[PDB]
């Protein structure tokens, strides 16, 4: 009866992202690692693991289609599937859309998570990364797109910091939503609400914010609604999800001030899903995640 | 904090990493890369990558370094994605086989292309392993040295002059230990500093572009421990009697919190008296409450 959430990392970048989620204690989900390369295997502590290798996206797609039945049996039962090939290119890019289409034909709410690489990484031809997004958005209910370039606006970031930041915000692209659904807080939500703003919703962007001390929830919320990762698209989004993670001492009044701000910041006709998550490991810090989907005609 | 990643590649490198994990080396991420799937399933590394499955069946590179080089290069995008974010990468291997000899330069070059401070720590095989393993290790060391800021070379032959005079497995365990000593002697300055704090920036200043290097290790307890451990270390057979001509020297003294500045300083006086007249010498200390009344000096010598 409660939502069954499965999180699928496919390809080297995807299995590695899933391994990071496991090491950071992301709870309440089933982890699935799918390897798509014949020549190598990244190992994983995921609950469920499937090797389909039997650096090219076409290779990753054929490997996944060859295993469509096995893949489908792993996904059967899920209310929600996340699919990511994480950072980097590779076969995962090709296999991701196959997993996503299987999940959506199964009727799971299917959320793709994809990263645009930094511009300083170059491009390898076919417009490979752009095609990978398009194929994924062709088969996802919601595609969360993380533009890594916008991280360089979040300061005077070093090259190592830029990579560590990309990893962290990718992880949050899953955690911020899944914790809202799976983990109790003062303000809880219905999986059905979440299904309503994300189903058939198309492309989404994300924003994050953190603060300590006085007015932490309003500060963190204002950082999140203003995140360069949202690419100034908050005002036109027709679906908006916001989750506030903090300690269990966080007062209703302060929470509500953040909820009121996202409503002022959002388009008047937007669906807004608002909740909180008790995470006492955070001290007097509070962490806001904002997912914006849709667009205004 | 600086993000430190330690890569064991090939069988010996993966075994050294397990020993690092067994002995509690902290503050680093351990990455095991091998061409044998069952040896990687016995690894306790945080991250594990099986390469060359098409070209080796998961049974090693058959002592062929070109096989190990192609297997790592085939996985270069994956490896790069595992290293991304590190300020410091160590690349550790037993030279002379196929996987470590061939693959270590690829891992190192990725770390260097990312701009991480890239430190190799590798062993020369024992003379009794035969002349092809020595030849292959020679080429592998030369390739590795092109892609490392500092490449620490540990001659296994000299291990047999130290400690107890037994068993083949015992000797390789000794290799595992000295590889750990070379990694820990450096990483602990950054992750668990004592009184004389030598941070990542300092280590980067002395180790960047430094070239080939040797190490010495020494420990002692009781009266005059810090002087004793320092003298064993600067006289270590692993230093191949070349300490005294080295112009860059990094030295760490690890001890419990009862280790006094006076003790530390007396060891430092001894080392710089014995050093090259023009040598750059950096001394740092490591708080390690696990050592009891023991003190442990590690010495890294480059620039001969
Ligand atoms: N530290 C350490 N060194 C080892 C161990 N076993 C072998 N060595 C050393 O490392 C060298 C390389 O061995 P090994 O690492 O196992 O080969 P490999 O790189 O995996 O190459 P392969 O795939 O062709 S079998 C050996 O020649 C020996 O000198 C070990 O258990 N610990
Ligand atoms: O550690 C493992 C073992 C495997 O069988 C596997 C298969 C596919 C994907 C990831 C995997 O990680």
From Swiss-Prot, chain A:
Q: Which GO terms describe its biological process?
A: division septum assembly; FtsZ-dependent cytokinesis; protein polymerization
Alphabetical UniProt keywords: Cell cycle, Cell division, Cytoplasm, GTP-binding, Nucleotide-binding, Septation
List S-S links within the chain. Answer: none
Q: What is its main location?
A: cytoplasm
Q: Which domain of life is it from?
A: Bacteria
- State if S-adenosyl-L-methionine is listed as a keyword: no
The yes or no answer to whether the keyword GTP-binding is present is yes
Residues that coordinate or bind GTP: 12-16, 90-92, 121, 125, 167
Localization, per the record, is: Cytoplasm
A single cellular component GO annotation? cytoplasm
Q: What is this protein called?
A: Cell division protein FtsZ
Recorded source organism is Mycobacterium tuberculosis (strain CDC 1551 / Oshkosh)
What broad taxonomic lineage does this protein's source fall under?
Bacteria, Bacillati, Actinomycetota, Actinomycetes, Mycobacteriales
